[PDB]
GROMACS .gro file of N, CA and C in nm:
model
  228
    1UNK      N    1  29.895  14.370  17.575
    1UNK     CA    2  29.771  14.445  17.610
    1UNK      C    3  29.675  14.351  17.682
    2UNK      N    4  29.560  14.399  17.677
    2UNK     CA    5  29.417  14.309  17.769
    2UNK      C    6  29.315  14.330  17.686
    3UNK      N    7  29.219  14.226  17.675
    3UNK     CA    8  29.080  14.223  17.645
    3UNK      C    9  28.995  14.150  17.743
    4UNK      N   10  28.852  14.185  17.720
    4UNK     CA   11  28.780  14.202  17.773
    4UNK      C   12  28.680  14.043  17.760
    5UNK      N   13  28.670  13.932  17.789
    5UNK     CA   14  28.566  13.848  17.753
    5UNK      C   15  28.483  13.784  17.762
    6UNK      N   16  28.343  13.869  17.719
    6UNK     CA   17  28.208  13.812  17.776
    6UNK      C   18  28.169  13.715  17.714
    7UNK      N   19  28.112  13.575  17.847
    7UNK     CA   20  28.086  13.471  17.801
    7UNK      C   21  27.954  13.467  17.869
    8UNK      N   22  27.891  13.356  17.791
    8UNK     CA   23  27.710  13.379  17.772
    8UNK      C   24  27.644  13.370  17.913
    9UNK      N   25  27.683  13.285  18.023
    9UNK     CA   26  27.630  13.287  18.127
    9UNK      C   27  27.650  13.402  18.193
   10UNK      N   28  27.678  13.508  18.128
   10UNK     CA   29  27.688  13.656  18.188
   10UNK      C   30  27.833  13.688  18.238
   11UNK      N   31  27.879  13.599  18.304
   11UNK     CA   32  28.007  13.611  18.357
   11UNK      C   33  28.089  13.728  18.283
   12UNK      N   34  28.217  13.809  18.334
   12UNK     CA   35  28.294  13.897  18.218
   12UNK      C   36  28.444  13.811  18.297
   13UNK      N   37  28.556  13.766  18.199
   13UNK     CA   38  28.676  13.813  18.278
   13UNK      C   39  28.784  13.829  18.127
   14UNK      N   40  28.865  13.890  18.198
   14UNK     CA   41  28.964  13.962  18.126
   14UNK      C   42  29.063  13.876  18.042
   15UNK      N   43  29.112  13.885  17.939
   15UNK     CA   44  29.249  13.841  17.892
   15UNK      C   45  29.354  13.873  17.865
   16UNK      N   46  29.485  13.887  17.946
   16UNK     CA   47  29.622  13.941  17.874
   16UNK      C   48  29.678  13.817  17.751
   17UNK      N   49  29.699  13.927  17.670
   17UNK     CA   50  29.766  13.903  17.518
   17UNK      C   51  29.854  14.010  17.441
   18UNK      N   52  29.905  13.976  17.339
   18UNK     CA   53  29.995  14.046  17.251
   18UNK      C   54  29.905  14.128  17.160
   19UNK      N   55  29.931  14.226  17.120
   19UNK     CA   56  29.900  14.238  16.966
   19UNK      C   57  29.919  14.147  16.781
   20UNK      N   58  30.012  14.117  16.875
   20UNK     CA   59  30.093  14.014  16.727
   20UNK      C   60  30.005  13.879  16.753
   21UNK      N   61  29.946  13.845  16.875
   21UNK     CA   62  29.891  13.708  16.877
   21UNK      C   63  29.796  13.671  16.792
   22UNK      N   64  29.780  13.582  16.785
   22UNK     CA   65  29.710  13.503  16.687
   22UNK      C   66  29.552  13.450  16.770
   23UNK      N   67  29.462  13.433  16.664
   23UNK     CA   68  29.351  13.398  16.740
   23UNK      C   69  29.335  13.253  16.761
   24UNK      N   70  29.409  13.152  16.724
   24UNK     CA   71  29.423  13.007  16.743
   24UNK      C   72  29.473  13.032  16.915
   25UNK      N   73  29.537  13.154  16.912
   25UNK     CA   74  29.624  13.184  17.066
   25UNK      C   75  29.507  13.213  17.149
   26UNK      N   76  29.440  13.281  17.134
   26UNK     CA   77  29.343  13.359  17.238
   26UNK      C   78  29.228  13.261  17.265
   27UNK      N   79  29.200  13.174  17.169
   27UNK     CA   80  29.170  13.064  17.159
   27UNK      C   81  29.146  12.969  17.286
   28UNK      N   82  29.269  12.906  17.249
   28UNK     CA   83  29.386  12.798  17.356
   28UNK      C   84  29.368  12.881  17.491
   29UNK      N   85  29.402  12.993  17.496
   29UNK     CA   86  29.371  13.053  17.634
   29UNK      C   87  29.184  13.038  17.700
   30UNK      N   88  29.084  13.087  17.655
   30UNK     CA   89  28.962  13.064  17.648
   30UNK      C   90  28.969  12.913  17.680
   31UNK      N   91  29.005  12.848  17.616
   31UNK     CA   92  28.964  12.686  17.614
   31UNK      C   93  29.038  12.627  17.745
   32UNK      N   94  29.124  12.642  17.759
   32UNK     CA   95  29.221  12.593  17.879
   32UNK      C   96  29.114  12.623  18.021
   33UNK      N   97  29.080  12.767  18.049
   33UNK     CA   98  29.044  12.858  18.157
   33UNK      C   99  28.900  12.805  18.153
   34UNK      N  100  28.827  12.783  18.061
   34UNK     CA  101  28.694  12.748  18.003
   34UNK      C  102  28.633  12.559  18.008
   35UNK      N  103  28.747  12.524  17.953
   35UNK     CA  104  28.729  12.396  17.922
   35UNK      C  105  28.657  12.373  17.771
   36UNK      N  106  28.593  12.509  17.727
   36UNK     CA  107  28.492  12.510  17.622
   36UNK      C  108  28.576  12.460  17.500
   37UNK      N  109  28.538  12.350  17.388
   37UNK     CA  110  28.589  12.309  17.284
   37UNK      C  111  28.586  12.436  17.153
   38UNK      N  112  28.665  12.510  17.093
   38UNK     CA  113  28.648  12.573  16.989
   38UNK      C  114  28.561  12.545  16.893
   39UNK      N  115  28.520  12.447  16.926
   39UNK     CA  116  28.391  12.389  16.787
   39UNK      C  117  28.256  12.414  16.831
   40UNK      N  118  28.248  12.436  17.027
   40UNK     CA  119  28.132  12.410  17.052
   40UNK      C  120  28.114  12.563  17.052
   41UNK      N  121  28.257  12.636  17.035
   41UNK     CA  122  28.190  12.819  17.088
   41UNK      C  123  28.217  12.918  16.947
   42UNK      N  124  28.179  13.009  16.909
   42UNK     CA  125  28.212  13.084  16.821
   42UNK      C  126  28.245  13.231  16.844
   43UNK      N  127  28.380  13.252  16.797
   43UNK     CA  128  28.366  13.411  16.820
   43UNK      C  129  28.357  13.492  16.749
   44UNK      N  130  28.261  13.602  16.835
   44UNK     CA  131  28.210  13.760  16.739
   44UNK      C  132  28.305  13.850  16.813
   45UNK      N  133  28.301  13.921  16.718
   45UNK     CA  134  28.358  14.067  16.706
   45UNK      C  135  28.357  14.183  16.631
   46UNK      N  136  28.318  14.267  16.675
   46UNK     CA  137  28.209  14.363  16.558
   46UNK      C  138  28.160  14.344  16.458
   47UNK      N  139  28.029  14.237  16.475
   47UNK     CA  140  27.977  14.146  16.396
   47UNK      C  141  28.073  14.048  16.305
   48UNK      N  142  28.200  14.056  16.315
   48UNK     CA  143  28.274  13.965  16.235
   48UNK      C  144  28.375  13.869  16.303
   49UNK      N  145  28.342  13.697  16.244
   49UNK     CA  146  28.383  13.599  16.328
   49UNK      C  147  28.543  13.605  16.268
   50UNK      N  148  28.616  13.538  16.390
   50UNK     CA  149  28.776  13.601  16.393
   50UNK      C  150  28.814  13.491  16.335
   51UNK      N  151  28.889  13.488  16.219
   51UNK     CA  152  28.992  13.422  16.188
   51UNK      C  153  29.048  13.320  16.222
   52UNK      N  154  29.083  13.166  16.200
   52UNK     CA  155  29.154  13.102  16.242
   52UNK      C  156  29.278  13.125  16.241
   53UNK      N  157  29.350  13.247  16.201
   53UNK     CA  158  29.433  13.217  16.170
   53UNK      C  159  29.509  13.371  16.176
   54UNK      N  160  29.458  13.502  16.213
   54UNK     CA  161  29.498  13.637  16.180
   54UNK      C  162  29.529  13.684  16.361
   55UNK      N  163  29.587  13.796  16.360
   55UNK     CA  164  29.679  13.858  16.460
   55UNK      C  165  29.559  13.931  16.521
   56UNK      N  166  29.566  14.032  16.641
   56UNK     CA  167  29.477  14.084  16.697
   56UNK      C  168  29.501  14.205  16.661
   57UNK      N  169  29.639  14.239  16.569
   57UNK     CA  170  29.693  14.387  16.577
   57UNK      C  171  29.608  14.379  16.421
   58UNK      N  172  29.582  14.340  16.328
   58UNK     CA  173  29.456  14.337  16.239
   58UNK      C  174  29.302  14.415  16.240
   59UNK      N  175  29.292  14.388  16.399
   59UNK     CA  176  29.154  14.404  16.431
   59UNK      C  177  29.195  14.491  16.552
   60UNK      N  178  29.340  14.558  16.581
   60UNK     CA  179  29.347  14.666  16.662
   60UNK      C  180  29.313  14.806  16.561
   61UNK      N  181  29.359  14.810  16.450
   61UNK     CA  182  29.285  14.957  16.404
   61UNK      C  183  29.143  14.973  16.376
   62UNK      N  184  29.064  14.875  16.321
   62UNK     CA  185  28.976  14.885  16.342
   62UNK      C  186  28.917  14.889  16.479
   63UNK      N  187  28.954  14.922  16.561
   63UNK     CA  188  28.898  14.980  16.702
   63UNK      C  189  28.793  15.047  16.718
   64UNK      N  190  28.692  14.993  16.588
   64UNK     CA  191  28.538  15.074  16.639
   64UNK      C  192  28.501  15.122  16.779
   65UNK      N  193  28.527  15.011  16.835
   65UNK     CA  194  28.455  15.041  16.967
   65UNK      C  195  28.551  15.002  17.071
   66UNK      N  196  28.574  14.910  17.233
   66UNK     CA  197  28.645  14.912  17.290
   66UNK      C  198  28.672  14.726  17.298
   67UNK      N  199  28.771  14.660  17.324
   67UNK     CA  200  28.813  14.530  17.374
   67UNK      C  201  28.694  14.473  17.415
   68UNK      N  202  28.681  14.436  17.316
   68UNK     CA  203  28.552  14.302  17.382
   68UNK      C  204  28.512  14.198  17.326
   69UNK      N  205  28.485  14.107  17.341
   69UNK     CA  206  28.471  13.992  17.289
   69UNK      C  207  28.353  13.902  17.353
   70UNK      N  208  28.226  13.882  17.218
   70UNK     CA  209  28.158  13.832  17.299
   70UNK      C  210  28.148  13.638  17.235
   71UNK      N  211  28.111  13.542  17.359
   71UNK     CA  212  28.104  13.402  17.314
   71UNK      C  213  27.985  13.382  17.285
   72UNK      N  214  28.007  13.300  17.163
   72UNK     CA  215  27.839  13.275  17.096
   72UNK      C  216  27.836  13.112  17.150
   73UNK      N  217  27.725  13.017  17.176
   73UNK     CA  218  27.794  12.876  17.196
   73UNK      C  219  27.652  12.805  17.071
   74UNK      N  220  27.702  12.721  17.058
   74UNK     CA  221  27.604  12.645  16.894
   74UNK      C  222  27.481  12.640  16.973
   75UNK      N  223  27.504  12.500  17.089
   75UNK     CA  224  27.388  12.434  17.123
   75UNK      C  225  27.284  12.603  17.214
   76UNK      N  226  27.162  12.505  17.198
   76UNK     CA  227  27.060  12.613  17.238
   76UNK      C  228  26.993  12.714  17.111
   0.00000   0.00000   0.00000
């Protein structure tokens, strides 16, 4: 599938992934494309920060709302 991921300087771009993936995965992707360190960014998702460690198909039924993902970053 694809998600959606807004990062703070406004920017939006997209991510292809699995359902079965893992968020250490979606992660590594963000960070690579980003350069951003996982320590320096945090992620939300319908108000709840994702897992080190859980699948996306977890947080596919809960499908409140639509693919999106927004980046929180510490500093500031």
């Amino acid at each position: 599938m694809q998600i959606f991921v807004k990062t703070l300087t406004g920017k939006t771009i997209t991510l292809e992934v699995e359902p079965s993936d893992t968020i250490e995965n979606v992660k590594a992707k963000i960070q690579d494309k980003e350069g951003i360190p996982p320590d320096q960014q945090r992620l939300i998702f319908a108000g709840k920060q994702l897992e080190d460690g859980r699948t996306l198909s977890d947080y596919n039924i809960q499908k409140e709302s639509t693919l999106h993902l927004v980046l929180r970053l510490r500093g500031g």
